[PDB]
Amino acid sequence: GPLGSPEPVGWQCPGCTFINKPTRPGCEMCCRARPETYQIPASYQPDEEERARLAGEEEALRQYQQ
Ligand SMILES: [Zn+2]
Numbered sequence: 293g294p295l296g297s298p299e300p301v302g303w304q305c306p307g308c309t310f311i312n313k314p315t316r317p318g319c320e321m322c323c324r325a326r327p328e329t330y331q332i333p334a335s336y337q338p339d340e341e342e343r344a345r346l347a348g349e350e351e352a353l354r355q356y357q358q
């Protein structure tokens with residue numbers, strides 16, 4: 293999960309400069325729901341674990357709502 297990296301490509305957290313993943317609707321420190329305004333970078337490229345869970349989550353969530 294979003295443990296932390298030197299060159300993050302997600303969104304920055306105001307409550308703390310942790311910067312979580314772009315596809316992570318919630319900081320792993322403050323738990324502040326990602327701002328809908330924020331967008332995900334096309335060149336994101338989620339890790340093997342990130343995509344493994346993301347691709348599946350959206351397959352059950354996105355497929356429903358979106
Ligand atoms: Zn936050």
Ligand SMILES: [Zn+2]
Nearest residue numbers: 305319321322
């Ligand atoms: Zn935070």
